[PDB]
């Protein structure tokens, strides 16, 4: 899993908004810099900027 290093507010409807410290499951990471992620903290799913998160434990 990954952790958010910054907050991120969605900029299109299918983005995922998240908070620093949130734990994320990366669901698709083959389409470019934006990854499809599922928040294990909120249960929501959407696209995220890959440079805002880092591998966690």
């Amino acid at each position: 899993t990954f952790v958010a290093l910054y907050d991120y507010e969605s900029r299109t409807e299918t983005d995922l908004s998240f908070k620093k410290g949130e734990r994320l499951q990366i669901v698709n990471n083959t389409e470019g810099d934006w990854w499809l992620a599922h928040s294990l903290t909120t249960g929501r799913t959407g696209y995220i900027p890959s440079n805002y998160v880092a591998p966690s434990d």
Partner: peptide, 12 residues
Amino acid sequence: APPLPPRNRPRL
């Protein structure tokens, strides 16, 4: 915060 990357290539 980091610069946001350009959006991915849209798929057709």
